[PDB]
Design a protein around this ligand. Sequence first.
Ligand SMILES: N[C@H](Cc1ncc[nH]1)c1ccccc1
Lengths: 300, 237
Amino acid sequence: MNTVPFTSAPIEVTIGIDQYSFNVKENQPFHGIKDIPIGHVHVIHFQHADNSSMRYGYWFDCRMGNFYIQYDPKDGLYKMMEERDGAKFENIVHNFKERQMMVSYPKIDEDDTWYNLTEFVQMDKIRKIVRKDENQFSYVDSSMTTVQENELSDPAHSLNYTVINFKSREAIRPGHEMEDFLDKSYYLNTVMLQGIFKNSSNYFGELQFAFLNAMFFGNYGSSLQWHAMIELICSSATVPKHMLDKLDEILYYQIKTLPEQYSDILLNERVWNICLYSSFQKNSLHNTEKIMENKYPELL
Amino acid sequence: GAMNSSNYAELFNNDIKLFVDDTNVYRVTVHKTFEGNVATKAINGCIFTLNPKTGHLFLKIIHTSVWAGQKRLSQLAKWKTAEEVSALVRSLPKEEQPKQIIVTRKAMLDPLEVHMLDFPNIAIRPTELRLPFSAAMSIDKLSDVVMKATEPQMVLFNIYDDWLDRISSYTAFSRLTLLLRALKTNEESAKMILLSDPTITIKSYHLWPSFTDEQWITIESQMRDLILTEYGRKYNV
Ligand SMILES: N[C@H](Cc1ncc[nH]1)c1ccccc1
């Protein structure tokens, strides 16, 4: 079990760690988060009390270094940093734990929610989309735009999510226009899974990473990406049976975890109605259809 | 964006554009089977592709053989339309290719966009106008060439005959749409108006009668009356 210490908490802020969150008051004696489960990527995220504008945060994995948070009064945010002196870090952490100035990652033993939301998400794979190679952790915020959004402006601050476009030469084989537009299996299986992603684990993971950024930061381009990756599967008549079963589980846990009061903005009516009721896979998402109908029957 | 009353003179500027109407592509008669079920029999159709500035009509005849062994024909008809329009564009010299294609029905947008991906600079546009191009098969010479076709065939016409020698494109398009609106609302009456005076003939190389300027004013007036009339017989006013 690993730890992310905080130098201090100089401004009042709501801090999230994965699907959990707690309020820290201005200059409250807070020195970080302990008992973080090893084996998963994690996200630590922030919303200031004075400017709810800009949720921001850091994807990180404790297996790949010792990380801490320190507020920067010039740039006005909580920054993640890596401590390369392992003994200095162990000492800091041990002293903060002894003074009980850390919150404990509050995982219920029964609870597989975070595993289920991050099953195909890794820290190395995440850096392929969020580019800042000098760090081990990755920064994301509410405002960052995607590469595809930028085609339709600062490239270094972009989310390099796989560009999916159903009315594109990549998606449509010359001479199979109607076939490929009405049944996207070519584009799913040859172009994306065999050509770019390499496997289903790659597809599910980028799709999962897109959802989590939409949910935690309200990142609109990430929501667009999540829905496009769902629609591309549901609009393919030929999908490996193991992928459909896994997709149903993935989406079930995403819909389960979504705050009820955010469904209006984070859920696209057209995609979900098309996916659950009209698409080729309208009968292949039993768990997802059941939770959607019992939790958001209005959207449908 | 969509073409409408507000941006109507755009049709007669010097940017090449085509209207595409797919109404008459997939045409059937519905009939009873010996068992008393219902079945369809396709008849030949046509794509109506029209340059509104010049009157040039690219009439692509759709022979019933194209439907053999196919399913979901009404959906296929829109994609076939888009395939043949794309083929026509590719066949034209670069300086004759359109800068915009205006589809008369919104369901043609995605099929045509996908077939024209190779032409990213050709704008595919819908319209808010309720244009009467479905009535093209009420023009006897167009109906005749479609029904007689034994194979896929493109036939070129000028739908304005020689009108542009004497009137502007705007006026020619207005006359055409008036004639076609009349034929659509009451074909028998409309055709009676056009052919009543036997001394006015249709030249072999034309579609419409050889009316003088004064006779066109009378004709146009009679078509307007018909459309209001039938609008009376229909709504009772
Ligand atoms: N980069 C991968 C998947 C991928 N392969 C090719 C393009 N994108 C990914 C997976 C998991 C989490 C985030 C990112």
